[PDB]
Amino acid sequence: TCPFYKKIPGTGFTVDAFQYGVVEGCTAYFLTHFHSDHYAGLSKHFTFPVYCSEITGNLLKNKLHVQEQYIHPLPLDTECIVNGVKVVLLDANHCPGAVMILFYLPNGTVILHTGDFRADPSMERSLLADQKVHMLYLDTTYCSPEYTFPSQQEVIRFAINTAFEAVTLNPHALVVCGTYSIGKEKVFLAIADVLGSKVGMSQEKYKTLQCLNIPEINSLITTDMCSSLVHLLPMMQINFKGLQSHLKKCGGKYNQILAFRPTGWTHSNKFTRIADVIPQTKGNISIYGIPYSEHSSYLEMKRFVQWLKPQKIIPTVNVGTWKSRSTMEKYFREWKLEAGY
Ligand code: NI
């Protein structure tokens, strides 16, 4: 049965609620982005209307085989009527195709559902500036002050410099990057660009990337492993065993692997600077864990919420324990008392 935080009061709408069967009263199912916890339950046998971005729509059709007739893509930054309710989709600065959804209820209440997001100051000059928000359905993944990590720009700078240095010293070194979902494409694309290479990957991952509307993508990726010195592999293969096995497969073309594991937050963040990160090494294999986040840091989240000044906050992440829920409620009250709303 569908939890309260996936229901939109005063509508027949749900958000990211496809694993509960037919939801009584739901006339339109919104999907914020193509991550499996959020789409869990959709398949080619779904027959209710699905509203989403163009990109999410490409992925539902090609990867999940949902039928065309039930896919409803909406452009971003555009007032749209759905089943007689005005809605707007906003870029969530998460993975490709990810949105936030603004709902303008028939009684005058305005609701923002963030989906998954990485808050940014640029959101303060979107259509959110223009009117008041009563209720906020908030991605609270990292809602605790221990959660620090650097900017995406700093992390990409570290990766580009690390890779270019290693391959310029040893032209026979291979770079490998792990992936298990869409998102974080900048990691492998920025590294391949500095090396003057395409990125090689499986047929299944190539297909996924072809759904994402990335400009000039045909110039950046390929299924021909041999021609490429940046390879993508499943995240589960990013360990000494998996990589050894992969190097065997390249037929004596390379004698060193340098590998990247983009993680979310890891406790090494509370002591160390990005500059000072060191790999795990065994032999001719080095693995770097880099903190490339597509969710808000605690400070970014706090800034956003203090700017928006919502009347009520409903968390959508970390909701399963009493201790989590109580901790999040304490920070919302500090923020409100500090800012005066
Ligand atoms: Ni996500």
From Swiss-Prot:
Compartments where found: Nucleus
> Listed GO molecular functions?
5'-3' DNA exonuclease activity; beta-lactamase activity; damaged DNA binding; zinc ion binding
Please provide, in alphabetical order, the Gene Ontology terms of the cellular component aspect for this entry.
Answer: fibrillar center; nucleoplasm
| Expression sites by tissue | Expressed in brain, heart, kidney, liver, pancreas, placenta and skeletal muscle.
Keyword Zinc-finger attributed = yes
What switches on expression, per the entry, is described as: During mitosis. The mRNA encoding this protein contains an internal ribosome entry site (IRES) in its 5'-UTR. This 5'-UTR generally suppresses translation while specifically promoting expression during mitosis, when cap-dependent translation may be impaired.
Mutation: H295A; reported impact is: Impaired nuclear focus formation, reduced interaction with PIAS and increased sensitivity to cisplatin
Its main subcellular localisation, reduced to a broad class, is nucleus
Classify the source by domain of life.
Eukaryota
UniProt entry keywords in alphabetical sequence = Cell cycle, Cell division, DNA damage, DNA repair, Hydrolase, Isopeptide bond, Metal-binding, Mitosis, Nucleus, Phosphoprotein, Ubl conjugation, Zinc, Zinc-finger
Q: Give me any GO biological process, just one.
A: cell division
What family does the database annotate? Belongs to the DNA repair metallo-beta-lactamase (DRMBL) family.
Partners and quaternary state? Binds constitutively to TP53BP1. Binds CDC27, which is itself a component of the anaphase promoting complex (APC). Binds PIAS1.
Its job: May be required for DNA interstrand cross-link repair. Also required for checkpoint mediated cell cycle arrest in early prophase in response to mitotic spindle poisons. Possesses beta-lactamase activity, catalyzing the hydrolysis of penicillin G and nitrocefin. Exhibits no activity towards other beta-lactam antibiotic classes including cephalosporins (cefotaxime) and carbapenems (imipenem).
Q: What is this protein called?
A: DNA cross-link repair 1A protein
Give the species: Homo sapiens (Human)
Range within the parent protein: 700 to 1040 of 1040
